[PDB]
């Protein structure tokens, strides 16, 4: 089964959307109720394990299309809503623990709620993927859910983060590097699911080696993207990314050795299988060095036993072939260095499923908007705590 590290959900303070004298009419009054109720419905779903992607999408759709009114102009989008700065929103971050952050900007709310929705997908994905009984359709759903999340993250970063007036801090969820790492991670993870399948269905070793390799690179990339953060909060996560890089590079060498073998090349085949097992042991090292490190999110232990059942066969096949040359044991002449993997995976690479927010609600009409009279203006709650497992 699959093991994916998860940082905690973002938490927020409840918003009543109650503007009092400012709201002069029934239509404007109704929207505030819709916002209040749809935001709350969405927030409670994050902690509902019985919730599925159809339900999550419908709630997000509701809230976001309403929320859009505080941001976009009615049909004139490319023109900005007068309501944007009306409300202060308060959100915590995945790596900052219970320390909240506030902006009176509807865009800050949109992006932060978006993030959580994307987070929810990767978490729906990881729970479903932790199943030992996992079926093919569940794996598609895992694979697909991770692609949704990737696309959302990407959309937030590309089309949204630039709109914020005040820049977010290093180590905060809405910052290019941090979002970029979430995007990359999601793709890596989807590919993990593809690899386990390519392995089940007995696809060509060269296919599986390239895919494993590229996946190791994604993890490297993500790790590098995060290297810019402060070790305190990024440590455990990075340890886990480094772990995953090794785990999958081993796979690359193992399956790439089978390539080299079928190529009548022995010494490098053996040197490749050796690199694999060495790497795989190095991954066991980093694995509980990761179990030590204190950081955001519960620590995760890999169930998968496969690597050795594969390597044993390869090792046994290689020795049969490469004895009377290099083997039987005490090998020569084996190349001092591991053969450098340069591999492109033509199959199994994952693209983010392109995301866009729903259009501004039909409920937002000029009259309804006019019924918010900002000339009628003259304490704070705290984030309700996410409270997961």
């Amino acid at each position: 089964t699959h093991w994916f590290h998860r940082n905690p959900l973002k938490a927020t303070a409840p918003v009543s959307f109650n503007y009092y004298g400012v709201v002069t009419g029934p239509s404007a009054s109704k929207i505030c109720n819709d916002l209040r109720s749809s935001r709350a419905r969405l927030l409670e779903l994050f902690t509902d394990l019985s919730c599925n992607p159809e339900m999550m999408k419908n709630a997000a759709d509701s809230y976001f299309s309403l929320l859009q009114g505080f941001i976009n102009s009615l049909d004139e989008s490319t023109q900005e809503s007068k309501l944007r700065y009306i409300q202060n929103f308060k959100w915590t971050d995945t790596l900052q623990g219970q320390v909240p952050s506030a902006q009176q900007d509807a865009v800050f709310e949109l992006i932060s709620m978006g993030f959580n929705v994307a987070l929810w997908y990767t978490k729906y994905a990881s729970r479903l993927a932790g199943k030992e009984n996992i079926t093919e359709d569940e794996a598609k759903e895992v694979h697909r859910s991770l692609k949704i999340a990737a696309g959302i993250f990407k959309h937030l970063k590309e089309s949204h983060l630039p709109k914020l007036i005040t820049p977010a801090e290093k180590g905060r969820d809405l910052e290019s590097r941090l979002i970029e790492a979430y995007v990359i991670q999601c793709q890596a993870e989807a590919q993990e699911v593809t690899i386990a399948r390519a392995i089940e269905l007995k696809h060509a070793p060269g296919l599986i080696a390239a895919l494993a390799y590229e996946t190791a690179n994604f993890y490297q990339k993500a790790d590098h993207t995060l290297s810019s953060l402060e070790p305190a909060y990024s440590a455990k996560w990075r340890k886990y990314l480094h772990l995953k890089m090794c785990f999958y590079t081993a796979y690359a060498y193992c399956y790439h050795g089978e390539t080299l073998l079928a190529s009548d090349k022995c010494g490098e085949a053996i040197r490749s299988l050796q690199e694999a097992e060495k790497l795989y042991a190095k991954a066991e090292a980093l694995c509980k060095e990761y179990g030590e490190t204190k950081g955001p999110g519960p620590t995760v232990k890999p169930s998968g036993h496969l690597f050795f059942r594969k390597l044993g066969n390869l090792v046994k096949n290689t020795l049969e072939k490469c004895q009377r040359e290099n083997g039987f044991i005490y090998f020569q002449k084996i190349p001092t260095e591991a053969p450098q993997l340069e591999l492109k995976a033509n199959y199994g690479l994952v693209e983010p499923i392109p995301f866009e927010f729903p259009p501004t609600s039909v409920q937002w009409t000029p009259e309804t908007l006019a019924a918010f009279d900002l000339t009628k203006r003259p304490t704070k709650p705290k984030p309700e705590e996410e409270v997961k497992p």
Binding site: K140, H143, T194, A198, L201, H203, N346, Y347, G348
Partner: peptide, 17 residues
Amino acid sequence: TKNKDGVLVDEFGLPQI
């Protein structure tokens, strides 16, 4: 369905075999 090179591919992007 098919990928860009015209080869049959499953939902995961793997060739069909």
